[PDB]
Chain A
């Protein structure tokens, strides 16, 4: 299982952001909006391959969550699709980024702005977000935003679509790494 792949909660489907860990404990990161109110995660629609359970959730205000892996056999690739990730960095305006989601696959573009505030309504406001010209569609939540071998962010949301084009915002991955003490591999 890698970044960009589907993940299933009792409520719907998201995307695995990045495979991370602390010591010998592995977790995965995804969107806070996916982890809020979800307990267990499964690797498939049938809900048979159990992945693990929610250890943390930060949404709204931020948009990151973490899931402690409980499946011992599932391979936990430290990649985004075939793509290896070695470190993490902070987005910069003009940075070329790539997103991978479980509905859309891989789409490229660049960072158009930093620290954007996005209001999803009903007090769901998030802040400190990476703005990009990359499209994303339902199902893509929590996917990875990378730049070559660097982890940059987690798909939070936005507007438009992949056919007509759109705007997507990403939550910096470093904030999430630091909140939980985990590191990418």
Chain B
């Protein structure tokens, strides 16, 4: 996952989970990428799936 096109002002809520470095499961890439932006780039991808 590439979060260059972020942030994005809105996200469709389809559920395809990812696991972040913060042990939080993000519902989909869009939610995931906007959080990575929100963290100013601090957040990463641990793996795909729920944490």
Contacts and interface: CB of A to CB of B under 8 A. Distances in A.
Interface of A: 11-14, 31, 33-34, 63, 101, 103, 118-122, 124, 136-141, 155-159, 167, 169
In the A-B complex, the 7 residue pairs with the smallest Cβ-Cβ separation, listed nearest first, are A138-B27, A139-B15, A157-B12, A12-B16, A138-B15, A13-B15, A33-B12
B11 A141 contact: no
Given A137-B27, A138-B27, A122 B13 contact: no
B5 A33 contact: no
Interface string B12-34: 11111100000000111011000
Interface of B: 5, 8-17, 26-28, 30-31
B14 A120 contact: no
A99 to B, nearest CB: 11
A85 to B, nearest CB: 21
B39 to A, nearest CB: 15
Given A103-B15, A141-B15, A121 B8 contact: yes
B16 A11 contact: yes
